[PDB]
C-alpha cells in the first residue's frame, strides 16, 4: 500500500464553475477561466492508517476529541434531523464510542476539522489544495463535464464513485458496493490518477467560502481573504441527485473550520514532492 502517494497535476488553464449551475445558491456560476501552475495532489483521501501515523508521531488530539462530540448520520447508528451530535464520535469512533476503525484502516479518515486537516497536511510536508486546484484536479483533464469521468453517472453501466442509491435518508441500497465509506483506493481513477475525488468523503480545501465570483481570469487563485466558513468539495457516500447533488466537480459547500462529521475528510496537495 502506498496510500500517501501523490500524482503530478499538470500546468494548465481550465473553466472553473459552470454557466449551467445546478445549485444556483452555492455560486456554481459563473464559469471562469483559471490558470493553475503544475503541482502535486494526493491520489487518495487521507486514510485512517495514514492519520494514525500522524497521531502516533505528534500526539495530536483532534478538535472533535476535545469538544467531546461530532456529527453522525442517523442511518448509521444539527443541519437536518438525520444529523445528530454524538458524544464520543470522532476519527477513531466514527459512529460513537462503541464503533471502531480496526476493520476499516484503509477507509478515509472522518470527523476531522479544517484545522485537523491543515495540521496533518503540514506535518506531512504538504498543504490543503485551493478550491481551484481541487476542482481542476477533480475534472481530470476534461472540459465542462459534470463528473471527473464525463457526463453519465454510470458510464458503461459501471459505478464510478461511492454515493447513495435508493431513497435518501430512509434506504441506501448499497448498489455501488458500499453503504458507508469505501477504501481510499476504491473505484476507477480519474484522468489524473485521483481516486474518490467525488463521493466517499467530502474534502476540505484551503479557501474561505464566498458565493460571489468575478468572471475575470485568474492565476492560482486563493479565494477571498476573509470569511467565516471554509470550502469543501466533491460530495460523499451520502450524496444523491434528489437532495445533495454535489458529487460534481463544480459543486461546492462549506462549514466553519472547527466542524467535523461522519462524511467529511480531506486529501493534501504540495508545490513539490515532500
Amino acid at each position: 500500500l502506498a496510500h500517501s502517494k501523490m500524482v503530478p497535476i499538470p500546468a494548465g488553464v481550465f473553466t472553473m464553475g459552470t454557466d449551467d449551475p445546478q445549485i444556483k445558491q452555492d455560486g456554481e456560476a459563473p464559469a471562469r477561466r483559471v490558470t493553475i501552475d503544475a503541482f502535486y495532489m494526493d491520489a487518495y483521501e487521507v486514510s485512517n492508517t495514514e492519520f494514525e501515523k500522524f497521531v502516533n508521531s505528534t500526539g495530536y488530539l483532534t478538535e472533535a476529541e476535545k469538544f467531546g462530540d461530532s456529527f453522525v448520520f442517523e442511518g448509521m447508528l444539527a443541519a437536518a434531523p438525520w444529523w445528530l451530535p454524538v458524544k464520543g464520535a470522532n476519527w477513531r469512533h466514527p459512529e460513537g464510542p462503541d464503533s471502531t476503525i480496526l476493520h476499516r484502516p484503509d477507509h478515509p479518515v472522518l470527523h476531522v476539522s479544517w484545522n485537523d486537516a491543515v495540521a496533518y497536511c503540514t506535518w506531512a510536508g504538504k498543504r490543503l489544495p485551493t478550491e481551484a486546484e481541487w476542482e481542476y484536479s477533480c475534472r481530470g483533464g476534461l472540459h465542462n463535464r459534470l463528473f471527473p469521468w464525463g457526463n453519465k453517472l454510470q458510464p458503461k453501466g459501471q459505478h464510478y464513485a461511492n454515493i447513495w442509491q435508493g431513497e435518501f435518508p430512509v434506504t441506501n441500497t448499497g448498489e455501488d458496493g458500499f453503504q458507508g465509506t469505501a477504501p481510499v483506493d476504491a473505484f476507477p481513477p480519474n484522468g489524473y490518477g485521483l481516486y474518490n475525488i467525488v463521493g466517499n468523503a467530502w474534502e476540505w480545501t484551503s479557501d474561505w467560502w464566498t458565493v460571489h465570483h468575478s468572471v475575470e481570469e485568474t492565476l492560482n487563485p486563493k479565494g477571498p481573504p476573509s470569511g467565516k466558513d471554509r470550502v469543501k468539495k466533491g460530495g460523499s457516500y451520502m450524496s444523491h441527485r434528489s437532495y445533495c447533488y454535489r458529487y460534481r466537480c463544480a459543486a461546492r459547500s462549506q462549514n466553519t473550520p472547527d466542524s467535523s462529521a461522519s462524511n467529511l475528510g480531506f486529501r493534501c496537495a504540495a508545490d513539490r514532492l515532500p
Binding site: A80, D229, K232, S236, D258
Partner: peptide, 5 residues
C-alpha cells in the same frame, strides 16, 4: 450536506 459545529 454536513452541519456546522
Amino acid at each position: 450536506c454536513t452541519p456546522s459545529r
